């Protein structure tokens, strides 16, 4: 009913984690479901390169995904980590965007606006079965990368362990992280 | 229509400080009907020097109490929240209330009464950028405060840290907490 | 209609103690169809001395396995839940996607949701319970078309309880990609 905006359930490599790299090195599953005045979100990232799939050979690691949308809620693929636009399940996608009233854009470097953040946790299950917490930070709007952009949504997964989940290459998977935010008018 | 809320960016509407006379904080609360459950979203922002200095202590508790009449309208005299919720689609808000079958009222006896509680976690980001977990307790119904009340929803954010997050005044903001509960019939 | 569930306050309908003949617990499971996903809500309540004494130990693992047929109905012989879910109205559309979460023959960890809920002990102490949800992945038989398993784990320095007390897992919410209607 128009109510789902997503990457599909099992997307091909569509996302770039590694700075400078020219083609997707990861698979971002992102699902945004419109429900009343909020969006319910579901996001998981799967590695698809040796670089991404060896990140957890280190104890401290940060993975950033930046999504920038235009005025009609379509991805700007050049600047975004995600290189393919989201699609509706069943035209404008403005109504899935984060509210600029609840999560306003602010003056670039003036004060602090922690009103624009969602924090949470998901996990990485290592090849030996050990489960490591990943701290999740979602930033909504707040700040523009350029003057072409109308909406912002960034994800940061952060691991800080006494130990490195891995000593070898292993398929990176962030366990599903769910979240909700106040959506813009349709 | 299927959303009952305070709006996305409410003016000070909630009293934290005991004895205080007018709102000292901004409560954002959004309740969305989703089949037989409600999906909830809640965050609290400080709007007074008292609230905005609580995090100078390492152990803090913040209580918000909401009491609703038989048609799911706030009772402002007894509730922490002094302005009623409104529907996005401008009748009864009964269908948004926590089920008295799932979350019963019981005799005022000491006890854990676990069935009436939802536990979870949200966060406070301090001025220095440090992230503090806040333990969240949601109580549904369980204890009637008087003969005027038909539904109860209370929130507690607890901080118990080894170090206080702040040494100075800073805008208190609870990162968004989401939860779901079984709702009453419309 | 858009809700598939046990109901809000079910009678004993679930078996936790392996080999036991009848329900020893009350599983509340609520699955709401929301666009391309299901939003789930699950809590377990003990209803036997065995279940209600588990938390006298520091290490506790509670497992529930749900096996569904092709039209999304519980297989009670093999499932921990002995009564089928009901619509508030085929429930295939409520089932976990075999595209997102495929069955496989034996590393494959995309089939897991991890999280936390809690147990409040009689003395008021709050204990976190580590939650693992597994979707499909392992096919036990030919009668089964979808799998949904829950594991609640406590590993504590100390035991929530010295005596019998009603086991209640605080509500755990989760979301997964659903199969086509």
Judge whether C129 and C117 are in contact, CB under 8 Å.
Answer: yes
C28 Cβ neighbours under 8 A, 6+ residues apart: B102, C5, C6, C7, C8, C9, C10, C41, C42, C43, C44, C45
Q: Name the token pair of C37.
A: 């996903």
What gap in Å lies between CA A150 and CA A172, rounded to an integer?
Answer: 31
* Partner A contacted by C175 (CB < 8 A): yes
In eight-state DSSP terms, residue B124 is E
Which chains have at least 3 CB atom pairs separated by less than 8 Å from chain A? B, C
Q: What are phi and psi of C73, to 5 degrees?
A: -105, 140
* Partner B contacted by C106 (CB < 8 A): no
First to last CA, chain A: 14
User: Is A180 in Cβ contact with B41 (below 8 Å)?
Assistant: yes
CA distances from A73 to A93, C14, C89 (A): 5, 45, 35
CA dihedral B69, B75, B81, B85 (to 10 degrees): 50
Give the closest residue to A134 by CA, choosing from A176, A170, A180. A176
Find the CB nearest B180 among C9, C41, C168.
C41
Judge whether A126 and A56 are in contact, CB under 8 Å.
Answer: yes
Judge whether B54 and B24 are in contact, CB under 8 Å.
Answer: no
What gap in Å lies between CA B186 and CA B163, rounded to an integer?
Answer: 47
Longest dimension (CA), chain A: 48
* Partner B contacted by A180 (CB < 8 A): yes
Q: How far is B114 from chain C (nearest CA, A)?
A: 6
Find the CB nearest C34 among A40, A44, A176.
A40
Substitution target from C3, C33, C97, C114 for chain A, most A beta carbons within 10 A: C114
CA A133-A134-A138 angle, 5° bins: 145
CA C33-C39-C42 angle, 5° bins: 125
Find the CB nearest B125 among A37, A101, A117.
A117
Judge whether B80 and B63 are in contact, CB under 8 Å.
Answer: yes
What gap in Å lies between CA A125 and CA C108, rounded to an integer?
Answer: 10
User: Is A9 in Cβ contact with C177 (below 8 Å)?
Assistant: yes
User: What CATH code would you report for A1-186?
Assistant: 2.60.90.10
Question: How many B/C residue pairs have CB atoms within 8 Å?
Answer: 64
CA dihedral A80, A84, A90, A94 (to 10 degrees): 20
CATH superfamily of C1-181: Adenovirus pIV-related, attachment domain (2.60.90.10)
A92 Cβ neighbours under 8 A, 6+ residues apart: A72, A73, A186
B118 contact residues in C (CB cutoff 8 A): 170-171
Sign of the alpha-carbon torsion through B19, B177, B43, B8: negative
What gap in Å lies between CA C17 and CA C11, rounded to an integer?
Answer: 17
What gap in Å lies between CA C129 and CA C165, rounded to an integer?
Answer: 17
Q: State the structure-solving technique.
A: X-ray
Give the closest residue to C172 by CA, choosing from C151, C156, C157. C151
Do the bridges between strand B37-46 and strand A151-160 make them parallel or antiparallel, or are there none, so unpaired? unpaired
Give the closest residue to B181 by CA, choosing from C85, C2, C42, A40. C42
User: Is A118 in Cβ contact with B175 (below 8 Å)?
Assistant: yes
Do the bridges between strand C37-46 and strand C25-34 make them parallel or antiparallel, or are there none, so unpaired? antiparallel
- The CA R_g of chain A, rounded to the nearest whole Å, is 16
Q: How far is CA B151 from the centre of its chain?
A: 13
Resolution (A): 2.1
C109 contact residues in A (CB cutoff 8 A): 125, 171, 173
Q: How far is A179 from chain B (nearest CA, A)?
A: 8
CA A20-A175-A30 angle, 5° bins: 60
B3 contact residues in A (CB cutoff 8 A): 36-38
Longest dimension (CA), chain B: 48
Q: In chain A, what are the domain boundaries? A: 1-186
What gap in Å lies between CA B119 and CA B152, rounded to an integer?
Answer: 16
Residue of C nearest to B135 (CA): C126
What gap in Å lies between CA B118 and CA B16, rounded to an integer?
Answer: 21
Do the bridges between strand B131-140 and strand B177-182 make them parallel or antiparallel, or are there none, so unpaired? unpaired
Judge whether B17 and A169 are in contact, CB under 8 Å.
Answer: no
Sign of the alpha-carbon torsion through A4, B31, B101, C43: positive
C123 Cβ neighbours under 8 A, 6+ residues apart: none
Q: Which residue has the tokens 């000070």?
A: B12
User: Is B3 in Cβ contact with A37 (below 8 Å)?
Assistant: yes
Q: Name the token pair of B146.
A: 């008087």
* Partner C contacted by A42 (CB < 8 A): yes
């Amino acid at each position: 009913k128009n109510n789902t905006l997503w990457t599909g359930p099992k997307p091909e490599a569509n996302c770039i984690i590694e700075y400078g790299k020219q083609n997707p090195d990861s698979k971002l599953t992102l699902i945004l479901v419109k429900n009343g005045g909020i969006v319910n979100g579901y996001v998981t990232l799967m590695g698809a390169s040796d670089y991404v799939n060896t990140l957890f050979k280190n104890k401290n690691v940060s993975i950033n995904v930046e999504l920038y949308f235009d005025a009609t809620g379509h991805i700007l693929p050049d600047s975004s980590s995600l290189k393919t636009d989201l699609e509706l399940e069943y035209s404008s996608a403005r109504g899935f965007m984060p509210s600029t009233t609840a999560y306003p854009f602010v003056l670039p470097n003036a004060g602090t606006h922690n009103e624009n953040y969602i924090f949470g946790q998901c996990y990485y299950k290592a090849s030996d079965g050990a489960l490591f917490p990943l701290e999740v930070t979602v930033m909504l709007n707040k700040r523009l990368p350029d003057s072409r952009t109308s909406y912002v949504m960034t994800f940061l997964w952060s691991l800080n362990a006494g130990l490195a989940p891995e000593t070898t290459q292993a398929t990176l998977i962030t366990s599903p992280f769910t979240f909700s935010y106040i959506r813009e008018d349709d």
